[PDB]
Amino acid sequence: KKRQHRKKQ
Amino acid sequence: QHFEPIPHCERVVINVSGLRFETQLRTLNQFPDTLLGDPARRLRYFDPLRNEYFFDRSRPSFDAILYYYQSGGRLRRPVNVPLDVFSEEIKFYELGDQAINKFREDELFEYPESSQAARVVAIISVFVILLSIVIFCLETLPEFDPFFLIETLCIIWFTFELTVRFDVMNVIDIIAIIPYFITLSLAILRVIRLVRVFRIFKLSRHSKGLQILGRTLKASMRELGLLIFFLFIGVVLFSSAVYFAEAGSENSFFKSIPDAFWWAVVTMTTVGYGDMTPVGVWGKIVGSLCAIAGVLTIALPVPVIVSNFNYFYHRET
Amino acid sequence: QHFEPIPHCERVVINVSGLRFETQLRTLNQFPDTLLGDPARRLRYFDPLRNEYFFDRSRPSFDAILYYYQSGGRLRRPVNVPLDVFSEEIKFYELGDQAINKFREDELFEYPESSQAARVVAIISVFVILLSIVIFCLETLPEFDPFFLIETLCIIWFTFELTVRFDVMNVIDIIAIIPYFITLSLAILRVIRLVRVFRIFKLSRHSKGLQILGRTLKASMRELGLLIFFLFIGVVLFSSAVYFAEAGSENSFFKSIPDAFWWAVVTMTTVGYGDMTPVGVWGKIVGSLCAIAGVLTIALPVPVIVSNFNYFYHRET
Amino acid sequence: QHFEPIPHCERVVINVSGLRFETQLRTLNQFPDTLLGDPARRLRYFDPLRNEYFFDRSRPSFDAILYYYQSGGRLRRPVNVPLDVFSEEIKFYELGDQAINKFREDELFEYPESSQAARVVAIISVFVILLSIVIFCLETLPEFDPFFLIETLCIIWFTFELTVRFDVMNVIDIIAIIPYFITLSLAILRVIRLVRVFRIFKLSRHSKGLQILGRTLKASMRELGLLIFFLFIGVVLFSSAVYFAEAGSENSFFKSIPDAFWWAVVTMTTVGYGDMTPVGVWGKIVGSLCAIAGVLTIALPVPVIVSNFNYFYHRE
Amino acid sequence: QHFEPIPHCERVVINVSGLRFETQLRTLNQFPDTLLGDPARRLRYFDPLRNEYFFDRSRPSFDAILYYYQSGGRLRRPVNVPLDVFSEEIKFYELGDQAINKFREDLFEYPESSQAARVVAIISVFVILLSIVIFCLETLPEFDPFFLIETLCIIWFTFELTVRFDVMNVIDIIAIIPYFITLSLAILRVIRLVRVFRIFKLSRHSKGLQILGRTLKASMRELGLLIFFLFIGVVLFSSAVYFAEAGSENSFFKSIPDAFWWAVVTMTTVGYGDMTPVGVWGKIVGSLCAIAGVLTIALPVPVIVSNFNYFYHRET
Amino acid sequence: AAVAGLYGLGKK
Ligand SMILES: [K+]
Ligand SMILES: [K+]
Structure with a gap:
């Protein structure tokens, strides 16, 4: 979980 | 559902700062208005010497822009750039107010205000x-x-x-x-x-957090109902099992299945019933199974509500 | 395992809307039928002026299409585009029903109806x-x-x-x-x-959700068995430890190791046993260790089960 | 907010090991100093034979470098390369001490130092x-x-x-x-x-980990306050509900709403109250609802704190 | 740390199925052996008509392969392709057994069961x-x-x-x-x-038991951190609850160690049982203890969970 | 259980 993480994009 | 153009008039070349794009003019003709849709808003970018369209802007984001013409109505932000840069890219070509609005959803009376008074x-x-x-x-x-x-x-x-x-x-x-x-x-x-x-x-x-909680509940009402349904099924099943474990035993701890209902709950939620001695071996086995199943049936639905709350909380800030 | 062709007959160029691809004809001739496999379905896209194949469609998704020819049977969607674009991408070239079907797995009778009556x-x-x-x-x-x-x-x-x-x-x-x-x-x-x-x-x-729960249980039987095994190991170990902690003290709270099993359970799942006073200091230390280990052992396997539930729930919707 | 250049003097071509980039010189001259900003530091890479700029380096990472000139101040790392290559690549062109520093934030006296025996x-x-x-x-x-x-x-x-x-x-x-x-x-x-x-x-x-816990608490004070607020709301609501469920029954288990507070807590956190028999059916329903709502309100805000602690621990 | 080549002999062009790569010959000369390092293993792919290196393979994976030459020792897989294809791409050029092992790191019938x-x-x-x-x-x-x-x-x-x-x-x-x-x-x-x-x-x-053992061996540090946090919480809250009840006649807790057990069954949400003889301050301390226990258990455990998940999927 | 979290799969 990060900012603009691979899960989100 | 969207319509894609098919080949056989003239082909044109688009030079997005060194990345050459070649498309049929019919594809550019599909969408009226827009910077690239009509000659009026794109003639300034024409190069008479090279017969090419030059757009000194971001190269990786032009693929989605061309795919809008390619797919004829589909605009999806590729996962290679932040949403901040892509928001400016769509504004440059002016794809259309309806097109931009559709993508927005893809992701006295002084009392109701905040001033000094x-x-x-x-x-x-x-x-x-x-x-x-x-x-x-x-x-x-x-x-x-x-x-x-x-x-x-x-x-x-x-x-x-x-x-x-x-x-x-x-x-x-x-x-x-x-x-x-x-x-x-x-x-x-x-x-x-x-x-x-x-x-x-x-x-x-x-309170801003309380409104976030309310929005989360409104969004995940379905998951809340599913969790309540799972809890009800588990409570009924384990209450029946634990009652029938003591059915044949004298001085039964549980008088009836509804009486055991509360017990089942405080075992599915791992709250704890308290005194547990007068229950035999079979009742203890049923209780262990109830505890495990309650752990499972609580851990399953909650993460969806957790994700909804996290999304709402981070969207607020 | 898949076979990849090796170089040395004639080379051809593929132009996916400006993105030039060069591939040996032997690689293209490996797969019969298909838009590009046979000359019948691909001569229409030939460009006599430039001797090039023109495919005015999505640039980024053609890499997987060529890699299917390159690997000679291996087709995987790269993580740069959504699933909707790639699903329609394959249908354009008609790689084959079997190839598409294989990719699908990579990611009276008046009662069973939804009529008004x-x-x-x-x-x-x-x-x-x-x-x-x-x-x-x-x-x-x-x-x-x-x-x-x-x-x-x-x-x-x-x-x-x-x-x-x-x-x-x-x-x-x-x-x-x-x-x-x-x-x-x-x-x-x-x-x-x-x-x-x-x-x-x-x-x-x-109930749609109950079928989802059943499918999740069927998929994660292995994880459920692992959780049960871990619980059994922990219960046996901690019940034995807590029984032998009170072996040397008169009026032992636990008469035997099996007698302690229930206690161990309601400590591993954090349900709680209730009265705890007649237990000595060593029993309390063993109980603290049991609570910690039970928390860990119940936390370990449930991510897989909840992820399976999430996958099934999202697939249903 | 950042400003981007607009077209109409002469355009130049940048060849990053075969990936040709064509940009207006006005964009290149937007940022003074730097390897590409001034002709002094970029004439060495000029190729007289083809009038092209050759930079034999990592192709995928040049897009962010050009976008910094394109956006006129916005430099963002695309998610296609590791952090090590990006840090070294930006140092090659010397974008500027302030520019690199801004990107850093985007992601006796013997006691303090445990060295020298x-x-x-x-x-x-x-x-x-x-x-x-x-x-x-x-x-x-x-x-x-x-x-x-x-x-x-x-x-x-x-x-x-x-x-x-x-x-x-x-x-x-x-x-x-x-x-x-x-x-x-x-x-x-x-x-x-x-x-x-x-x-x-x-x-x-x-202890290094306890400092991580302290930093996590400092970062997630807001989430801790939100969790405390939710717990207080739930405790008050369910204590009032359970007390009023027993108002009409003689020998009430709870004498008043504040007396019930503690009970609500041990039901909201799923700790357990112990003796629970003298509570009627309505109190039992209220207790079940309290347990479920406490599970919900505990599970909602803890992932943020968990993520902060994990990020700090794995950054340390 | 790795060494990168610097410009000024002749530059060569690589055509990976239409994706043209241009690099200095010294960059390819940096690594001996290998398909592209020496002319013996790459002269077959030469095109006399075009003077180009033709490698009809996966285009997106050649960036990392070239970057190994570019970085002079650093080989990182970009997030655009699965791990299966990358393992096949690296084997084609024969980068070197030592180089591939970096990414690798990235009677007697009782052990081997065979029918009987x-x-x-x-x-x-x-x-x-x-x-x-x-x-x-x-x-x-x-x-x-x-x-x-x-x-x-x-x-x-x-x-x-x-x-x-x-x-x-x-x-x-x-x-x-x-x-x-x-x-x-x-x-x-x-x-x-x-x-x-x-x-x-x-x-x-049992395969799962070995996975659990490997997880414990990997996350010994996280287990120690969890134990340390629990010990700190138990000491603090036991002392607080003892001092919140020492002034009342017939105190529930005789001493701080006597309260230790209570603190534990409140941090782990196990539950203590009877709780009436404790006053208001003790109840407040208990509520704080329960909340802090939830936090201190939810903080480090997910790291061990992640380690176990990784080991479980690696096994299968 | 108050964890109810997946998070990143972990190191490599
Ligand atoms: K409990
Ligand atoms: K509990």
């Missing part, structure tokens, strides 16, 4: 709400007119704020003052003195 | 199931013909529905009606009265 | 802290000069360390020794003998 | 389960017949151990040491307790 009004309302809650809790105490005066002052402030203001916020404001005027079979009295607690929900107007 | 039957069935559950839980009460008539009406409805209909749903329907006909040693009677509760599982036919 | 001092300090904690706990026992001597030795060591040393660490160091010197109504005495426990926080200077 | 030892294993599992059952049953109050089965199990265990001849062997030795010991009562109690270690022999036959 509205802040004191808000803090006064918060203090009054907290005072009303405190007076409620203390008037329920066994040690106890002095409470009635504070209660009626809070009610006058609440109704004054409601009248000045005039969804769900107004409904909560109304319900917070209905019971006071109701007082002006003891079951109805108990119900109204219970619904007096709804004044605590007036903090939603002044 | 079928929803009433479904609502009657679910109402009857709920009524049967209620009648069961009320007939088990100490305060109690009136229940037998309702039970036999529910059984008649269940048998009528089963006969009209005529996996696992049919097994559940059979089990929900076996015990009533069975009644027409006390251990067998207790077992049949217990298995009567399986009528609650008939809601799976009408 | 001073780790012995640290282990002695840890041993003294543990001994002080043990002596405190043992002196609270009913079975009990021998404790006072050890306690005052620990206090002398603590004050010697604090004085030779001379933030939150210093505040904790001072608080760990205030109560001993204070003792040289009984409510104040109870408060000081309670705050004497703050010597356990002295391990912060030596 | 597929039974021996089931007999061993059955014997282990039987020994556990005999242990638990002989601890019952109602109970030679148990000793015979115990000695048969020990005979089988020692036969297997001596035929076989890490940690599995250590556990096997421990599972039979106490039986041979029997051939102050504190030592007797200790050996009868350590007799339970026979339950760990299932590690040889």
